DNA sequence: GGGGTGTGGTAGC
DNA sequence: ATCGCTACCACACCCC
């Protein structure tokens, strides 16, 4: 048990934070792509016809945590009991629930108390601990399998549990659905054996947006092949609005009142005009949502195939800590700001870059929000503020960066005990070259 | 036109 | 108890 003002707080919070493990796994996957394909150039051109295999583990954490469960859960049955991965018993986020749990309508992200209340009496929720190293190991088996199979020209990290895999079809050869239906089976089986029992689902299409939607139609433990020539009302009607890329809870809300509450992608499909759509959710987002409702990708999304190196290169670096923030005085806020900058400088140095620009974001307790929110150590309800500072010459100096960071907090005006959350960023990054003379 | 900003949206949760 | 993390783009304005 470690308070925010203990020198050890950052290391411990990161050791238990599944969100931190997720972002770091993500980040390490993107660097290994940039080292593996440093002199390879098997990227996607417009001269290429390609198919997208979008591959993802079914209830990833839930599965790995069950497969590696301690002897205390030996009798747990993974297709018979609702299983969640979580820290706690009340206001603890469910990082992953199995599909037994999803029948009762439990979702990823809910709290244990909120998922328990949806089970009928006589049904027990099972809560497995996080198994972070096993998550990492299993993922490694997944990416090793994909590359070993020798059937993709580009393998794109999406996640600890996801990749977009591109196969180029030479125009001599002729692709068919039984050929496709059957790479899927090879992939699913090979990953199953390699992961010692984890299952993946695959969506397969001539577009990223259709492979994403197909992947969702395929889950659990299955695969869906849906090309643009296969589109039907039956397809669109099997999706809700935020199933679509580019649609989070706010865009979703905006669409639901500009178009008389569409309930399936088919509804939205038949009721929308491009121009009312732009005016409702924003023009660029609206042109992507319009493209997506036809199965076609956007130019912003296609870049990941044409220059995946430029897309997956890290253009900023940052930490976020919005849990357990309870400082009493400014001296403690500064020391923790200092310990954050040193951690970020460690990351900046491992990648041999400087930063031109930093940013501090913070969360401040809303004036009438309780000082302790329902969630233990939660941020509670907060307004956020941020400020940025452009540094003269790019640097990796702790003196300069930490001092400007503490000044950006001194400037935002937030009393130490109203602090509930901190974010520390390095924005513009420069590679350190061989010349360093003025 | 270019450059900047803080806020807010999506994505991967 | 409980561990609410990162990275990118879009936008509405301001500057020269
Ligand atoms: N709100 C969330 C969503 C996901 N995760 C973690 C746990 C997941 O196991 C992992 C992968 O995310 P996915 O979106 O792929 O969800 P799942 O793999 O758990 O289930 P599925 O993809 O079959 O729907 O990310 C989390 O911690 N909090
Ligand atoms: Mn998954
Ligand atoms: Mn996933
Ligand atoms: Mn959505
Ligand atoms: Mn997901």
Short mmCIF file of C-alpha atoms (C1' of nucleotides) and ligand atoms in Angstrom, two decimals:
data_model
loop_
_atom_site.label_atom_id
_atom_site.label_comp_id
_atom_site.label_asym_id
_atom_site.label_seq_id
_atom_site.Cartn_x
_atom_site.Cartn_y
_atom_site.Cartn_z
CA UNK A 1 0.00 0.00 0.00
CA UNK A 2 1.66 3.17 -1.38
CA UNK A 3 0.45 6.77 -1.21
CA UNK A 4 0.92 9.26 -4.04
CA UNK A 5 3.62 11.17 -2.12
CA UNK A 6 5.74 8.05 -1.53
CA UNK A 7 8.73 7.90 -3.90
CA UNK A 8 7.47 4.43 -4.97
CA UNK A 9 3.98 5.50 -6.03
CA UNK A 10 4.63 5.73 -9.77
CA UNK A 11 6.27 2.29 -10.03
CA UNK A 12 3.49 0.64 -8.02
CA UNK A 13 0.57 2.29 -9.76
CA UNK A 14 2.08 1.28 -13.09
CA UNK A 15 2.60 -2.28 -11.82
CA UNK A 16 -1.13 -2.71 -11.11
CA UNK A 17 -2.55 -0.47 -13.86
CA UNK A 18 -3.81 -2.55 -16.77
CA UNK A 19 -4.11 0.68 -18.74
CA UNK A 20 -0.42 1.27 -18.27
CA UNK A 21 0.52 -2.26 -19.37
CA UNK A 22 -1.75 -1.77 -22.40
CA UNK A 23 -0.13 1.48 -23.53
CA UNK A 24 3.40 0.22 -22.96
CA UNK A 25 2.77 -3.07 -24.79
CA UNK A 26 1.27 -0.97 -27.61
CA UNK A 27 4.32 1.31 -27.62
CA UNK A 28 6.82 -1.55 -27.57
CA UNK A 29 4.98 -3.25 -30.45
CA UNK A 30 5.29 -0.11 -32.57
CA UNK A 31 9.05 0.19 -31.99
CA UNK A 32 9.67 -3.46 -32.87
CA UNK A 33 7.79 -2.86 -36.10
CA UNK A 34 10.12 0.07 -36.82
CA UNK A 35 13.20 -2.05 -36.07
CA UNK A 36 12.04 -5.24 -37.84
CA UNK A 37 11.12 -3.40 -41.08
CA UNK A 38 13.91 -0.82 -41.07
CA UNK A 39 15.27 -2.01 -44.44
CA UNK A 40 12.19 -3.86 -45.57
CA UNK A 41 9.81 -1.95 -47.85
CA UNK A 42 6.98 -4.45 -48.48
CA UNK A 43 4.43 -1.69 -47.93
CA UNK A 44 1.13 -1.17 -49.74
CA UNK A 45 0.88 0.74 -53.01
CA UNK A 46 -2.04 1.62 -55.26
CA UNK A 47 -0.54 -0.91 -57.70
CA UNK A 48 -1.51 -3.53 -55.09
CA UNK A 49 -4.81 -5.30 -54.59
CA UNK A 50 -5.06 -6.47 -51.00
CA UNK A 51 -7.27 -8.17 -48.45
CA UNK A 52 -7.41 -7.15 -44.77
CA UNK A 53 -7.35 -9.88 -42.09
CA UNK A 54 -8.33 -8.15 -38.81
CA UNK A 55 -7.49 -10.61 -36.01
CA UNK A 56 -8.39 -10.31 -32.33
CA UNK A 57 -8.48 -12.50 -29.19
CA UNK A 58 -11.88 -13.32 -27.74
CA UNK A 59 -12.08 -11.92 -24.13
CA UNK A 60 -8.26 -11.67 -24.06
CA UNK A 61 -7.51 -11.03 -20.37
CA UNK A 62 -10.44 -13.18 -19.26
CA UNK A 63 -9.12 -16.05 -21.34
CA UNK A 64 -5.45 -15.81 -20.37
CA UNK A 65 -6.38 -15.30 -16.68
CA UNK A 66 -8.56 -18.39 -16.72
CA UNK A 67 -5.99 -20.54 -18.53
CA UNK A 68 -3.38 -19.59 -15.97
CA UNK A 69 -5.65 -19.47 -12.94
CA UNK A 70 -4.26 -20.34 -9.52
CA UNK A 71 -5.30 -23.59 -7.84
CA UNK A 72 -7.94 -21.61 -5.91
CA UNK A 73 -10.01 -21.41 -9.14
CA UNK A 74 -9.27 -24.92 -10.47
CA UNK A 75 -12.95 -25.91 -10.62
CA UNK A 76 -13.99 -22.76 -12.52
CA UNK A 77 -15.57 -23.73 -15.90
CA UNK A 78 -14.89 -21.16 -18.64
CA UNK A 79 -17.94 -21.92 -20.81
CA UNK A 80 -20.28 -22.35 -17.84
CA UNK A 81 -19.54 -19.47 -15.45
CA UNK A 82 -19.50 -15.67 -15.86
CA UNK A 83 -15.83 -14.74 -15.42
CA UNK A 84 -14.33 -11.25 -15.06
CA UNK A 85 -10.76 -9.98 -14.68
CA UNK A 86 -10.62 -7.28 -12.03
CA UNK A 87 -8.82 -6.03 -8.93
CA UNK A 88 -11.71 -5.61 -6.62
CA UNK A 89 -15.18 -6.43 -5.44
CA UNK A 90 -17.18 -3.19 -5.66
CA UNK A 91 -16.10 -0.22 -7.80
CA UNK A 92 -13.42 -2.07 -9.75
CA UNK A 93 -13.45 -1.92 -13.55
CA UNK A 94 -14.00 -5.23 -15.31
CA UNK A 95 -11.05 -5.32 -17.68
CA UNK A 96 -12.46 -8.39 -19.45
CA UNK A 97 -15.50 -10.58 -19.04
CA UNK A 98 -16.09 -13.90 -20.79
CA UNK A 99 -19.02 -14.42 -23.13
CA UNK A 100 -20.98 -16.28 -20.48
CA UNK A 101 -20.88 -12.97 -18.60
CA UNK A 102 -21.94 -11.09 -21.75
CA UNK A 103 -25.15 -13.14 -22.04
CA UNK A 104 -26.41 -11.38 -18.92
CA UNK A 105 -25.37 -8.10 -20.63
CA UNK A 106 -22.20 -7.49 -18.61
CA UNK A 107 -19.75 -5.46 -20.70
CA UNK A 108 -16.03 -4.75 -20.62
CA UNK A 109 -15.44 -1.67 -18.51
CA UNK A 110 -18.32 -2.02 -16.03
CA UNK A 111 -17.75 -2.21 -12.27
CA UNK A 112 -18.03 -5.48 -10.38
CA UNK A 113 -20.94 -4.11 -8.35
CA UNK A 114 -22.71 -3.19 -11.61
CA UNK A 115 -22.14 -6.60 -13.21
CA UNK A 116 -23.14 -8.53 -10.09
CA UNK A 117 -26.52 -6.79 -10.06
CA UNK A 118 -27.33 -8.22 -13.55
CA UNK A 119 -26.96 -11.86 -12.63
CA UNK A 120 -30.04 -13.78 -11.50
CA UNK A 121 -29.94 -15.35 -8.06
CA UNK A 122 -28.02 -18.61 -7.95
CA UNK A 123 -25.46 -17.29 -10.45
CA UNK A 124 -22.01 -16.41 -9.13
CA UNK A 125 -19.70 -13.96 -10.80
CA UNK A 126 -16.12 -15.28 -10.77
CA UNK A 127 -13.32 -12.68 -10.56
CA UNK A 128 -9.86 -13.67 -11.70
CA UNK A 129 -6.77 -11.62 -10.90
CA UNK A 130 -4.72 -9.94 -13.60
CA UNK A 131 -1.91 -12.08 -15.06
CA UNK A 132 0.12 -9.41 -16.81
CA UNK A 133 3.20 -11.44 -17.72
CA UNK A 134 0.97 -14.19 -19.14
CA UNK A 135 -0.85 -11.55 -21.17
CA UNK A 136 2.51 -10.47 -22.56
CA UNK A 137 3.72 -14.03 -23.21
CA UNK A 138 0.49 -15.10 -24.95
CA UNK A 139 0.56 -12.00 -27.16
CA UNK A 140 4.12 -12.86 -28.17
CA UNK A 141 2.90 -16.31 -29.29
CA UNK A 142 0.22 -14.55 -31.33
CA UNK A 143 2.64 -12.32 -33.23
CA UNK A 144 5.19 -15.10 -33.67
CA UNK A 145 2.48 -17.32 -35.19
CA UNK A 146 1.29 -14.58 -37.60
CA UNK A 147 4.78 -13.94 -38.99
CA UNK A 148 5.78 -17.63 -39.02
CA UNK A 149 2.73 -18.49 -41.21
CA UNK A 150 4.39 -16.50 -44.05
CA UNK A 151 1.10 -15.36 -45.62
CA UNK A 152 0.95 -11.58 -44.97
CA UNK A 153 2.92 -8.76 -46.56
CA UNK A 154 2.18 -6.35 -43.70
CA UNK A 155 1.38 -7.24 -40.08
CA UNK A 156 0.18 -4.17 -38.19
CA UNK A 157 0.15 -3.99 -34.38
CA UNK A 158 -3.19 -2.72 -33.15
CA UNK A 159 -3.06 -3.87 -29.54
CA UNK A 160 -1.66 -6.48 -27.21
CA UNK A 161 -4.48 -8.63 -28.65
CA UNK A 162 -5.03 -7.28 -32.20
CA UNK A 163 -3.32 -6.96 -35.51
CA UNK A 164 -4.44 -5.85 -38.94
CA UNK A 165 -2.80 -8.27 -41.40
CA UNK A 166 -2.60 -7.43 -45.10
CA UNK A 167 -2.30 -10.02 -47.88
CA UNK A 168 -1.46 -8.72 -51.35
CA UNK A 169 -3.08 -10.67 -54.18
CA UNK A 170 -0.95 -10.79 -57.35
CA UNK A 171 -3.19 -10.14 -60.34
CA UNK A 172 -2.00 -13.36 -61.95
CA UNK A 173 -3.48 -15.46 -59.09
CA UNK A 174 -7.23 -15.29 -58.36
CA UNK A 175 -8.63 -14.96 -54.85
CA UNK A 176 -11.70 -16.94 -53.81
CA UNK A 177 -13.80 -17.22 -50.70
CA UNK A 178 -12.86 -20.81 -49.99
CA UNK A 179 -9.21 -19.79 -50.17
CA UNK A 180 -10.10 -16.96 -47.76
CA UNK A 181 -12.43 -19.04 -45.51
CA UNK A 182 -9.52 -21.25 -45.12
CA UNK A 183 -6.61 -18.96 -44.33
CA UNK A 184 -8.93 -17.92 -41.47
CA UNK A 185 -9.18 -21.50 -40.26
CA UNK A 186 -5.41 -21.95 -40.52
CA UNK A 187 -4.81 -18.73 -38.55
CA UNK A 188 -7.41 -19.50 -35.89
CA UNK A 189 -6.12 -23.04 -35.37
CA UNK A 190 -2.43 -22.16 -35.48
CA UNK A 191 -2.93 -19.36 -32.92
CA UNK A 192 -5.06 -21.68 -30.76
CA UNK A 193 -2.29 -24.28 -30.60
CA UNK A 194 0.46 -21.68 -30.23
CA UNK A 195 -1.36 -19.86 -27.41
CA UNK A 196 -2.14 -23.18 -25.69
CA UNK A 197 -5.84 -22.54 -25.91
CA UNK A 198 -6.64 -18.90 -26.60
CA UNK A 199 -9.07 -18.22 -29.45
CA UNK A 200 -9.12 -15.41 -32.00
CA UNK A 201 -11.84 -14.09 -34.27
CA UNK A 202 -11.20 -12.76 -37.77
CA UNK A 203 -12.89 -10.29 -40.06
CA UNK A 204 -11.82 -10.52 -43.69
CA UNK A 205 -12.53 -7.91 -46.34
CA UNK A 206 -11.15 -5.57 -48.99
CA UNK A 207 -11.38 -2.65 -46.50
CA UNK A 208 -10.27 -1.88 -42.95
CA UNK A 209 -13.72 -0.64 -41.99
CA UNK A 210 -15.40 -3.80 -43.28
CA UNK A 211 -12.80 -6.06 -41.64
CA UNK A 212 -13.47 -4.29 -38.32
CA UNK A 213 -17.24 -4.70 -38.63
CA UNK A 214 -16.86 -8.27 -39.92
CA UNK A 215 -14.53 -9.07 -37.02
CA UNK A 216 -17.29 -7.99 -34.63
CA UNK A 217 -19.87 -10.10 -36.45
CA UNK A 218 -17.48 -13.06 -36.20
CA UNK A 219 -17.07 -13.00 -32.42
CA UNK A 220 -16.82 -15.24 -30.31
CA UNK A 221 -14.44 -17.90 -31.75
CA UNK A 222 -15.31 -17.43 -35.41
CA UNK A 223 -14.65 -15.64 -38.67
CA UNK A 224 -16.54 -13.54 -41.18
CA UNK A 225 -15.63 -12.84 -44.80
CA UNK A 226 -17.49 -9.79 -46.12
CA UNK A 227 -16.20 -7.92 -49.15
CA UNK A 228 -17.73 -4.78 -50.62
CA UNK A 229 -19.52 -6.92 -53.20
CA UNK A 230 -21.25 -8.84 -50.40
CA UNK A 231 -22.82 -5.88 -48.63
CA UNK A 232 -26.49 -6.33 -47.74
CA UNK A 233 -29.15 -4.96 -45.42
CA UNK A 234 -28.75 -8.15 -43.35
CA UNK A 235 -25.13 -7.08 -42.83
CA UNK A 236 -25.76 -3.49 -41.80
CA UNK A 237 -28.80 -4.37 -39.65
CA UNK A 238 -26.63 -6.55 -37.39
CA UNK A 239 -24.69 -3.53 -36.06
CA UNK A 240 -25.46 -0.76 -33.60
CA UNK A 241 -24.36 2.82 -34.24
CA UNK A 242 -21.22 2.99 -32.16
CA UNK A 243 -20.06 -0.33 -33.64
CA UNK A 244 -18.94 1.87 -36.50
CA UNK A 245 -15.41 3.30 -36.43
CA UNK A 246 -15.35 7.01 -35.68
CA UNK A 247 -18.41 6.71 -33.38
CA UNK A 248 -17.85 7.10 -29.65
CA UNK A 249 -20.45 8.07 -27.08
CA UNK A 250 -20.66 11.73 -28.20
CA UNK A 251 -20.86 11.24 -31.97
CA UNK A 252 -23.34 8.45 -31.24
CA UNK A 253 -25.40 10.87 -29.17
CA UNK A 254 -25.27 13.51 -31.89
CA UNK A 255 -26.37 11.06 -34.58
CA UNK A 256 -29.23 9.77 -32.45
CA UNK A 257 -31.01 13.13 -32.37
CA UNK A 258 -30.20 14.39 -35.87
CA UNK A 259 -31.63 11.18 -37.40
CA UNK A 260 -34.55 10.18 -35.13
CA UNK A 261 -32.64 7.54 -33.10
CA UNK A 262 -31.32 4.97 -35.62
CA UNK A 263 -31.05 1.54 -33.99
CA UNK A 264 -28.96 -0.37 -36.52
CA UNK A 265 -26.37 0.73 -39.05
CA UNK A 266 -29.04 -0.07 -41.63
CA UNK A 267 -31.35 2.58 -40.10
CA UNK A 268 -28.64 5.25 -40.15
CA UNK A 269 -27.79 3.99 -43.65
CA UNK A 270 -31.21 4.74 -45.13
CA UNK A 271 -31.97 7.94 -43.17
CA UNK A 272 -28.77 9.93 -43.62
CA UNK A 273 -27.69 12.63 -46.04
CA UNK A 274 -23.98 13.47 -46.21
CA UNK A 275 -24.68 17.15 -45.54
CA UNK A 276 -26.95 16.73 -42.53
CA UNK A 277 -24.28 14.26 -41.37
CA UNK A 278 -21.39 16.74 -41.57
CA UNK A 279 -23.51 19.39 -39.86
CA UNK A 280 -24.33 16.97 -37.03
CA UNK A 281 -20.98 15.40 -36.04
CA UNK A 282 -18.48 17.55 -37.91
CA UNK A 283 -17.45 17.61 -41.54
CA UNK A 284 -14.28 15.48 -41.50
CA UNK A 285 -15.80 12.94 -39.12
CA UNK A 286 -18.98 13.03 -41.19
CA UNK A 287 -17.15 12.32 -44.42
CA UNK A 288 -15.46 9.34 -42.70
CA UNK A 289 -18.78 8.06 -41.34
CA UNK A 290 -20.25 8.47 -44.84
CA UNK A 291 -17.37 6.50 -46.36
CA UNK A 292 -17.69 3.85 -43.65
CA UNK A 293 -21.39 3.32 -44.36
CA UNK A 294 -20.36 2.32 -47.92
CA UNK A 295 -17.55 -0.05 -46.88
CA UNK A 296 -14.83 2.34 -48.08
CA UNK A 297 -11.95 3.66 -45.98
CA UNK A 298 -10.90 7.30 -45.46
CA UNK A 299 -7.62 8.81 -46.57
CA UNK A 300 -6.61 9.25 -42.93
CA UNK A 301 -7.15 5.51 -42.31
CA UNK A 302 -5.45 4.32 -45.51
CA UNK A 303 -2.16 5.96 -44.48
CA UNK A 304 -1.42 3.04 -42.15
CA UNK A 305 -1.06 0.82 -45.22
CA UNK A 306 0.83 3.24 -47.46
CA UNK A 307 3.32 4.55 -44.88
CA UNK A 308 2.94 2.42 -41.75
CA UNK A 309 6.44 3.49 -40.73
CA UNK A 310 5.46 7.15 -40.63
CA UNK A 311 2.15 6.34 -38.91
CA UNK A 312 3.56 4.08 -36.14
CA UNK A 313 6.51 6.30 -35.29
CA UNK A 314 5.92 7.85 -31.89
CA UNK A 315 5.41 11.61 -32.25
CA UNK A 316 4.84 12.31 -28.53
CA UNK A 317 5.42 10.77 -25.13
CA UNK A 318 3.36 11.14 -21.97
CA UNK A 319 2.10 9.67 -18.69
CA UNK A 320 -1.38 9.94 -17.16
CA UNK A 321 -2.17 9.48 -13.47
CA UNK A 322 -5.79 10.12 -12.50
CA UNK A 323 -6.09 7.64 -9.62
CA UNK A 324 -4.86 8.06 -6.04
CA UNK A 325 -4.07 11.77 -6.41
CA UNK A 326 -4.29 13.22 -2.87
CA UNK A 327 -1.56 15.76 -2.15
CA UNK A 328 -1.82 18.24 0.73
CA UNK A 329 0.83 20.81 -0.21
CA UNK A 330 2.52 22.15 -3.34
CA UNK A 331 5.87 20.69 -2.27
CA UNK A 332 4.44 17.19 -2.78
CA UNK A 333 2.86 18.04 -6.12
CA UNK A 334 6.28 19.30 -7.26
CA UNK A 335 8.17 16.21 -6.10
CA UNK A 336 5.70 13.98 -7.93
CA UNK A 337 5.86 16.21 -11.01
CA UNK A 338 9.66 15.80 -10.70
CA UNK A 339 9.39 12.00 -10.43
CA UNK A 340 7.13 11.97 -13.48
CA UNK A 341 9.55 14.02 -15.60
CA UNK A 342 12.42 11.73 -14.66
CA UNK A 343 10.39 8.70 -15.63
CA UNK A 344 9.47 10.33 -18.95
CA UNK A 345 13.08 11.37 -19.53
CA UNK A 346 14.09 7.74 -19.04
CA UNK A 347 11.61 6.92 -21.83
CA UNK A 348 12.78 9.87 -23.96
CA UNK A 349 16.39 8.71 -23.58
CA UNK A 350 15.73 5.05 -24.43
CA UNK A 351 14.58 6.28 -27.85
CA UNK A 352 17.32 8.85 -28.35
CA UNK A 353 15.15 11.93 -28.88
CA UNK A 354 14.80 15.43 -27.45
CA UNK A 355 11.58 17.34 -26.90
CA UNK A 356 10.69 20.82 -28.15
CA UNK A 357 7.41 21.26 -26.31
CA UNK A 358 5.89 20.00 -23.08
CA UNK A 359 2.37 20.01 -21.71
CA UNK A 360 0.77 19.51 -18.28
CA UNK A 361 -2.86 18.39 -18.02
CA UNK A 362 -4.67 18.13 -14.70
CA UNK A 363 -8.03 17.27 -13.25
CA UNK A 364 -9.59 19.52 -10.61
CA UNK A 365 -12.48 18.49 -8.36
CA UNK A 366 -15.73 20.11 -9.43
CA UNK A 367 -16.80 22.62 -6.80
CA UNK A 368 -19.73 20.54 -5.50
CA UNK A 369 -18.27 17.08 -6.19
CA UNK A 370 -17.55 15.05 -3.03
CA UNK A 371 -13.93 15.11 -1.93
CA UNK A 372 -13.91 11.30 -2.03
CA UNK A 373 -15.88 9.93 -5.01
CA UNK A 374 -17.71 6.57 -5.03
CA UNK A 375 -14.62 4.94 -6.51
CA UNK A 376 -11.86 4.39 -3.98
CA UNK A 377 -9.11 6.88 -4.84
CA UNK A 378 -11.00 7.88 -7.98
CA UNK A 379 -10.68 11.19 -9.71
CA UNK A 380 -14.42 11.77 -9.24
CA UNK A 381 -16.19 14.43 -11.28
CA UNK A 382 -13.69 16.99 -12.52
CA UNK A 383 -13.02 19.74 -15.00
CA UNK A 384 -9.72 19.39 -16.84
CA UNK A 385 -7.21 22.10 -17.70
CA UNK A 386 -3.95 22.01 -19.61
CA UNK A 387 -1.19 24.36 -20.64
CA UNK A 388 1.76 24.00 -22.98
CA UNK A 389 5.18 25.65 -23.21
CA UNK A 390 7.53 25.78 -26.19
CA UNK A 391 11.15 25.25 -25.15
CA UNK A 392 13.84 27.19 -26.97
CA UNK A 393 16.32 24.53 -28.02
CA UNK A 394 15.19 20.86 -27.98
CA UNK A 395 16.42 19.20 -24.80
CA UNK A 396 16.63 16.11 -22.63
CA UNK A 397 17.73 18.08 -19.56
CA UNK A 398 15.82 17.35 -16.36
CA UNK A 399 16.55 20.84 -15.02
CA UNK A 400 14.87 22.58 -17.95
CA UNK A 401 11.95 20.17 -18.39
CA UNK A 402 11.04 19.68 -14.72
CA UNK A 403 11.30 23.42 -14.01
CA UNK A 404 9.01 24.29 -16.90
CA UNK A 405 6.60 21.52 -15.83
CA UNK A 406 6.37 22.86 -12.32
CA UNK A 407 5.82 26.33 -13.76
CA UNK A 408 2.96 25.09 -15.95
CA UNK A 409 1.35 23.65 -12.82
CA UNK A 410 2.11 26.90 -10.86
CA UNK A 411 0.26 28.72 -13.69
CA UNK A 412 -2.88 26.60 -13.94
CA UNK A 413 -3.90 27.76 -10.51
CA UNK A 414 -5.13 24.49 -8.99
CA UNK A 415 -4.80 24.23 -5.19
CA UNK A 416 -2.89 21.05 -4.28
CA UNK A 417 -5.80 19.34 -2.49
CA UNK A 418 -8.17 20.04 -5.33
CA UNK A 419 -5.81 18.11 -7.63
CA UNK A 420 -7.28 14.81 -8.69
CA UNK A 421 -5.31 13.88 -11.78
CA UNK A 422 -2.11 14.71 -13.63
CA UNK A 423 -0.85 14.32 -17.21
CA UNK A 424 2.77 15.05 -18.30
CA UNK A 425 3.66 15.27 -22.00
CA UNK A 426 6.60 15.71 -24.36
CA UNK A 427 5.06 16.87 -27.65
CA UNK A 428 7.39 17.78 -30.43
CA UNK A 429 10.23 15.26 -30.59
CA UNK A 430 13.51 15.42 -32.52
CA UNK A 431 15.91 12.56 -33.32
CA UNK A 432 19.43 13.13 -31.91
CA UNK A 433 21.78 13.06 -34.82
CA UNK A 434 25.66 12.78 -35.08
CA UNK A 435 26.21 16.55 -35.43
CA UNK A 436 25.85 18.42 -32.12
CA UNK A 437 27.97 21.58 -32.72
CA UNK A 438 25.74 24.61 -31.91
"C1'" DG B 1 -1.60 31.08 -46.90
"C1'" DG B 2 1.29 29.84 -42.97
"C1'" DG B 3 2.06 29.32 -37.90
"C1'" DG B 4 0.08 28.98 -32.91
"C1'" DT B 5 -3.27 27.63 -29.00
"C1'" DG B 6 -6.44 24.70 -25.42
"C1'" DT B 7 -10.46 21.71 -25.78
"C1'" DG B 8 -12.50 17.71 -27.18
"C1'" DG B 9 -13.14 13.74 -30.30
"C1'" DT B 10 -11.82 9.19 -31.85
"C1'" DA B 11 -8.71 5.11 -31.40
"C1'" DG B 12 -6.38 1.23 -28.95
"C1'" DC B 13 -9.16 0.58 -23.73
"C1'" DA C 1 -10.73 -0.77 -1.15
"C1'" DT C 2 -8.25 -0.42 -5.90
"C1'" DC C 3 -4.49 0.73 -9.33
"C1'" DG C 4 -9.85 5.67 -14.24
"C1'" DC C 5 -3.51 4.54 -19.50
"C1'" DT C 6 -1.39 6.72 -23.97
"C1'" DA C 7 -1.39 9.00 -29.01
"C1'" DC C 8 -3.27 10.95 -32.71
"C1'" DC C 9 -6.30 14.25 -35.24
"C1'" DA C 10 -10.10 17.92 -35.72
"C1'" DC C 11 -11.80 22.24 -34.46
"C1'" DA C 12 -12.67 27.29 -33.30
"C1'" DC C 13 -10.45 30.69 -32.68
"C1'" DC C 14 -6.04 33.88 -32.32
"C1'" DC C 15 -1.44 35.77 -34.83
"C1'" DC C 16 1.44 37.70 -38.70
N1 LIG D 1 -13.02 -1.12 -21.21
C1 LIG D 1 -11.90 -2.01 -21.36
C2 LIG D 1 -11.76 -2.82 -22.60
C3 LIG D 1 -10.61 -3.72 -22.72
N2 LIG D 1 -9.63 -3.82 -21.67
C4 LIG D 1 -8.50 -4.72 -21.78
C5 LIG D 1 -8.84 -5.96 -21.45
C6 LIG D 1 -9.04 -6.77 -22.85
O1 LIG D 1 -8.85 -8.18 -22.63
C7 LIG D 1 -8.09 -6.23 -23.67
C8 LIG D 1 -8.42 -6.33 -25.15
O2 LIG D 1 -9.47 -5.44 -25.45
P1 LIG D 1 -10.69 -5.93 -26.45
O3 LIG D 1 -11.43 -4.72 -26.98
O4 LIG D 1 -10.14 -6.79 -27.60
O5 LIG D 1 -11.83 -6.84 -25.63
P2 LIG D 1 -11.72 -8.42 -25.27
O6 LIG D 1 -10.47 -9.08 -25.87
O7 LIG D 1 -11.66 -8.52 -23.76
O8 LIG D 1 -13.10 -9.15 -25.83
P3 LIG D 1 -13.55 -9.17 -27.42
O9 LIG D 1 -12.50 -8.49 -28.28
O10 LIG D 1 -13.76 -10.65 -27.83
O11 LIG D 1 -14.87 -8.46 -27.62
O12 LIG D 1 -8.10 -4.75 -23.31
C9 LIG D 1 -9.77 -3.03 -20.43
O13 LIG D 1 -8.93 -3.15 -19.58
N3 LIG D 1 -10.93 -2.12 -20.31
MN1 LIG D 2 -10.11 -8.97 -28.14
MN1 LIG D 3 -8.81 -5.98 -29.15
MN1 LIG D 4 -18.01 3.10 -31.09
MN1 LIG D 5 -11.64 -3.31 -28.66
#
